Amino acid sequence: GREFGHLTRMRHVITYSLSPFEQRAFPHYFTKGIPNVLRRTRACILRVAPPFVVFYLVYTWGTQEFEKSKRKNPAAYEN
Amino acid sequence: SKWLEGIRKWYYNAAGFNKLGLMRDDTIYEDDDVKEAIRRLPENLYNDRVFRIKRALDLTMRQQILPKEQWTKYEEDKFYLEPYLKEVIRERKEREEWAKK
Amino acid sequence: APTLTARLYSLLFRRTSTFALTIAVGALFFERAFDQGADAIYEHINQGKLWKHIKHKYEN
Amino acid sequence: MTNIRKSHPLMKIINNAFIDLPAPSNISSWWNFGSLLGICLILQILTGLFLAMHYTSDTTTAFSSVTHICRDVNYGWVIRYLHANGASMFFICLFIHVGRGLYYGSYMFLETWNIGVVLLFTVMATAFMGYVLPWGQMSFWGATVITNLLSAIPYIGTDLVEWIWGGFSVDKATLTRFFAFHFILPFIITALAAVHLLFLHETGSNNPTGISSDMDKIPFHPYYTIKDILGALFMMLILLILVLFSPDLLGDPDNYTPANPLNTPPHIKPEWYFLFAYAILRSIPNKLGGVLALVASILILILMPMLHTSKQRSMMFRPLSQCLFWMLVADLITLTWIGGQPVEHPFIIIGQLASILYFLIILVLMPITSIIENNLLKW
Amino acid sequence: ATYAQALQSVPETQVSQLDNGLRVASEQSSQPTCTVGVWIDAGSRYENEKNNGAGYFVEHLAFKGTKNRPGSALEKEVESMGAHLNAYSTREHTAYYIKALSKDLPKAVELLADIVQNCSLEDSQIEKERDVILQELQENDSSMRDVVFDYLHATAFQGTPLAQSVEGPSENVRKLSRADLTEYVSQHYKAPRMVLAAAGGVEHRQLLDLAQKHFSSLSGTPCRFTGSEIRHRDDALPLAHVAIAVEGPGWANPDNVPLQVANAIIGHYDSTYGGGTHMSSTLASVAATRKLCQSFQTFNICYAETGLLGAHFVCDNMSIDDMMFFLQGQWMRLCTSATESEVVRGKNILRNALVSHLDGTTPVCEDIGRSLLTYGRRIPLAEWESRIAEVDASVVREVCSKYFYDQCPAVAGLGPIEQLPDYNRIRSGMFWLRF
Amino acid sequence: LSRFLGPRYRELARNWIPTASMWGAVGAVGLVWATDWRLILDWVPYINGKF
Numbered sequence A: 001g002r003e004f005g006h007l008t009r010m011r012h013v014i015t016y017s018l019s020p021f022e023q024r025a026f027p028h029y030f031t032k033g034i035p036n037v038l039r040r041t042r043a044c045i046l047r048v049a050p051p052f053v054v055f056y057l058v059y060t061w062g063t064q065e066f067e068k069s070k071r072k073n074p075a076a077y078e079n
Numbered sequence B: 001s002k003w004l005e006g007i008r009k010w011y012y013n014a015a016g017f018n019k020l021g022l023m024r025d026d027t028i029y030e031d032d033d034v035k036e037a038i039r040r041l042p043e044n045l046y047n048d049r050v051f052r053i054k055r056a057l058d059l060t061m062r063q064q065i066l067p068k069e070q071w072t073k074y075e076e077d078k079f080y081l082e083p084y085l086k087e088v089i090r091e092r093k094e095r096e097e098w099a100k101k
Numbered sequence C: 001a002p003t004l005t006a007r008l009y010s011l012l013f014r015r016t017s018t019f020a021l022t023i024a025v026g027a028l029f030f031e032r033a034f035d036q037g038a039d040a041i042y043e044h045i046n047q048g049k050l051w052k053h054i055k056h057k058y059e060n
Numbered sequence D: 001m002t003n004i005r006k007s008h009p010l011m012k013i014i015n016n017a018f019i020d021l022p023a024p025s026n027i028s029s030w031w032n033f034g035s036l037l038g039i040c041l042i043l044q045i046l047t048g049l050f051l052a053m054h055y056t057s058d059t060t061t062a063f064s065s066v067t068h069i070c071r072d073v074n075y076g077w078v079i080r081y082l083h084a085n086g087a088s089m090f091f092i093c094l095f096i097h098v099g100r101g102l103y104y105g106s107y108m109f110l111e112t113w114n115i116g117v118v119l120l121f122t123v124m125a126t127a128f129m130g131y132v133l134p135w136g137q138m139s140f141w142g143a144t145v146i147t148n149l150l151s152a153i154p155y156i157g158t159d160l161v162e163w164i165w166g167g168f169s170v171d172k173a174t175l176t177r178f179f180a181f182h183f184i185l186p187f188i189i190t191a192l193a194a195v196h197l198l199f200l201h202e203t204g205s206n207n208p209t210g211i212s213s214d215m216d217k218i219p220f221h222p223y224y225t226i227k228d229i230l231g232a233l234f235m236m237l238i239l240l241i242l243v244l245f246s247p248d249l250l251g252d253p254d255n256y257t258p259a260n261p262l263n264t265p266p267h268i269k270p271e272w273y274f275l276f277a278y279a280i281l282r283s284i285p286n287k288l289g290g291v292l293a294l295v296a297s298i299l300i301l302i303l304m305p306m307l308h309t310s311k312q313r314s315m316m317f318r319p320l321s322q323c324l325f326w327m328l329v330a331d332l333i334t335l336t337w338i339g340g341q342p343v344e345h346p347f348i349i350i351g352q353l354a355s356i357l358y359f360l361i362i363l364v365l366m367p368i369t370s371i372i373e374n375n376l377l378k379w
Numbered sequence E: 001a002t003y004a005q006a007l008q009s010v011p012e013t014q015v016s017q018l019d020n021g022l023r024v025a026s027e028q029s030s031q032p033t034c035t036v037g038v039w040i041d042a043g044s045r046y047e048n049e050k051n052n053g054a055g056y057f058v059e060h061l062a063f064k065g066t067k068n069r070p071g072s073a074l075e076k077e078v079e080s081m082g083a084h085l086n087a088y089s090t091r092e093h094t095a096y097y098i099k100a101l102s103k104d105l106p107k108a109v110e111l112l113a114d115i116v117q118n119c120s121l122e123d124s125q126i127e128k129e130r131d132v133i134l135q136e137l138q139e140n141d142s143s144m145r146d147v148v149f150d151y152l153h154a155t156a157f158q159g160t161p162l163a164q165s166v167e168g169p170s171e172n173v174r175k176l177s178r179a180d181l182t183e184y185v186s187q188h189y190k191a192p193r194m195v196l197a198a199a200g201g202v203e204h205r206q207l208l209d210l211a212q213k214h215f216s217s218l219s220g221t222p223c224r225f226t227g228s229e230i231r232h233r234d235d236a237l238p239l240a241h242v243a244i245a246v247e248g249p250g251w252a253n254p255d256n257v258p259l260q261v262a263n264a265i266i267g268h269y270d271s272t273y274g275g276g277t278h279m280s281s282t283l284a285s286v287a288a289t290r291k292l293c294q295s296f297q298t299f300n301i302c303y304a305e306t307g308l309l310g311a312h313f314v315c316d317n318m319s320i321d322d323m324m325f326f327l328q329g330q331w332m333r334l335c336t337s338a339t340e341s342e343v344v345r346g347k348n349i350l351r352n353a354l355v356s357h358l359d360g361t362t363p364v365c366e367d368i369g370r371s372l373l374t375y376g377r378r379i380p381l382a383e384w385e386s387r388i389a390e391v392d393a394s395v396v397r398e399v400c401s402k403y404f405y406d407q408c409p410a411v412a413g414l415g416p417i418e419q420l421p422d423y424n425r426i427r428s429g430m431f432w433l434r435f
Numbered sequence F: 001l002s003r004f005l006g007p008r009y010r011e012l013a014r015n016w017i018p019t020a021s022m023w024g025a026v027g028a029v030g031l032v033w034a035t036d037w038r039l040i041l042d043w044v045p046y047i048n049g050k051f
């Protein structure tokens, strides 16, 4: 079936690599990760957050409305 | 139409495949028609597509992006696969219409 | 003149869908007949030794 | 000479499945959960087995046997709460896996997706019966309500319910049935998972880009074996946090009272991983309509591959589809929260709107938005 | 003119009968050349195990010399005229015909008479032809299609004369003596069982008077089809030949018309066909796409009261199974779900085959002789077209169900046929559980 | 599914409708027999003797 011998036809692509023992496992981990993490967060925040913000607003409103509904209504005891 | 052109450009920028150096036809889902169209592509176009896809996969592996000036420009994006796919789909439609009779 | 078996194949066994229907209808009638016959055999062998054969004396 | 790993039959299967399997190099951490699921399954068996060595499925001894496990058996509390919280972790990973499949268009693997839907149903049934097993107040009354749902089926509902119950209501017969079925089902789940991996390996795995990755494939072993080990370690960290610091966080206190058929608990709700479906069930006033909506809530995954109208597979390049997906996720969270909450003034209307929005997003909004994106991309 | 008008304008075949029973038939077409031949209702199926090679032996030494033109003289005469003399003998018919200029019609007819009646069987010539026929058998072995069809006939009609090959066993060839050949000729080469046919520049009155001149001095078992198989396993052969058939109808059965249409729907394929994957026949398209078959073809070999209806294909070692599957599936489709468009295409194919096969004086003569031997009459192309037009999808489905659906077939395999499905599996393939 | 909205498929259906109907009857008879419906078996002349 699908085996490394025959998956696709590729030509004129050169890949240079390094031994794991010749390179650092965490090269520029913070100084490059933090800007990259910020970039990814900026890209994805406008797509992910708004639905959860709406959910939180709905949750707070529903909890407040339920708590108000459980509260006593003075107008029922005017007489 | 100018507003349509503007919103199309905005969506092209929003769809971040250009940020990976890809072209529009690289992102197409490889169904039977797309597979046939790829198999009909001339060798240079096929090799360019394969390298672009491999580079995009390498970029996504490291969660990185291509430099700002290397992103595929919307106005210079070439729909290389579109004619071949159109022909393949036309042929499939003809075969299905014959089968209908 | 076609034999009975020839008639059966041509009318019921030639097409599998009709073949299945014959089996299904046959199974319905076979179950009732076989159970009725088998019960009769068992009750005849054990005549007077079953509750259904002695209930009348004690019932009502 | 030859290589045993490549020639021996069992070694051939194992090598082609987990060692030399060509795997995409760009698959993110969202691809770990699959393996995580397997781990959970294995755990849910091992732990489960060591609970069956002391549990007795009798109404006069089930609760006492559970207390014996959590009171007398050496490290019995560890095993019991590992089981209880591992079920929740299993469903967390299941939900995340289904979300990954929806987001990255993994449902285009039709046979794999369908076997996954079957696995989801089987796991839900197993968890339901396992939760019925302790025979607390929550177990008994949740079983009563969920099984009574089947009575809404027309013309066979009562007979089917009384056949499953083994009597006129949930009683000792039902408890023993559920113990046997809960014991046996996970092995059927393992067989279905083997078939699932068989179907998946027929075409390989997908990737975040949604583009075929045959040009960039790596051996599964050196990279993804260690990646999945790290993922399993993180999952084990979360599970052990839940089992050693908040063992009763995801449970309900009312399940620590012996089952009382003559006294309902103050609130009757199922486990959290069912709440969303429960919420949908409560949106429809009609019983049969509610049951049908509950079934469709999971059967919609079957329709998901056919609803795919976009030219691109993954949502990685479809921002509007991403917004719809996150709206759907927030909607599912809303349904879970409401299923937790009682049936009162705001919760009823919010649940009805949430169920309507769930079905609308999955059925109507997503295909239309994909078509709009296709028109925006000029194809 | 339209197709119907062209059909109605085809010259009719004139048939007369001599006083001794010989049937003289002609189709004039106003051409410089003409074919004239004699078709005898004699063949292998009229022979028993004692003289199973008599007909082929007689055909072999028919032209070697006569009582009036000893030795090679006959040949020279024919060659002097530029005429071509040919002969054949199937399991049911024998034929000796001459292609010659119409001006040479008389002499040719005379020669034919001399070939048919006054045949001289010299003992030395008989021995020479015996050696030739033995070598011919050793060469016939090399021809795989002929071997597989002979195996099909042997297994399908086992215990009956039709199982016997035309050439006969080598032992029978060695045993055959002049007395046996003379007795066979005297019994079988009789006027009521022969037809003198001619087409081309011939005139019916001229041919009839020539026949009365030369042919006047002339003398005045329903086979059982058996579902079986013969497998000649020989892995040394490069390709595997398979021939699978079912009991067909006779010559006179009308069902021959729709069945041919059915075969036209299945079609034929060969590795050298340029149609490729776009072939209308689904089986042909599959064979071209999957490289399942070097060449396959459906056949309808009719006899007096029976026939073989089926297919023959040549496949690789690892493909036989698949091919058989698809082949059987095709049959089942025709038995259960045959549509109108494919039936129309098959009818057009059959019309084209009928009109195309009758192009040339020799094909027309062969058609006339074979039709008179089998049908007793020459069926005009107009009648063939009417019968074809009567065919529709329902007729095709009904006839295929009658002859194909749930029927025991006869199978002949040859070569690397290890993958050829077991007869139980093939028989199970001869019906559909879904239907 | 306009691929199947053709005259041939209409003919294809008509060829298989009798077969599908026959298999449906097998399912109907099988279900009644297996479950002992007795809503339908009461009508059956000889089977109604039971119950």
Ligand code: HEM
Binding pocket: D041, D044, D045, D046, D047, D048, D049, D051, D052, D055, D066, D069, D080, D083, D084, D087, D090, D123, D126, D127, D129, D130, D131, D132, D133, D134, D182, D183, D186, D189
């Ligand atoms: C996918 C697999 C499984 C799932 C999702 C699952 C789920 C559950 C759940 C949620 C409970 C409720 C525990 C509680 O609330 O205290 C439970 C109880 C139980 N399960 Fe399972 N289980 C699985 C596999 C197994 C297996 C394989 C066995 C036995 C071989 C088993 C035996 C038990 C027993 C004896 C109990 C009652 C003991 C107790 O409640 O502490 N489980 N299961």
Ligand code: HEM
Binding pocket: D030, D031, D032, D033, D034, D035, D037, D038, D041, D094, D097, D098, D101, D104, D106, D107, D109, D112, D113, D115, D116, D117, D119, D120, D123, D189, D193, D196, D200, D204, D205, D206, D207, D301
């Ligand atoms: C006990 C339950 C399950 C087990 C043990 C399981 C196991 C796995 C494993 C090990 C993988 C490979 C790792 C990966 O690709 O992430 C996988 C992939 C996959 N699973 Fe599951 N799975 C389960 C449930 C499901 C469910 C509920 C669905 C869908 C509703 C599903 C659909 C898929 C799909 C589509 C893939 C391929 C993902 C891709 O290639 O992008 N599975 N599964």
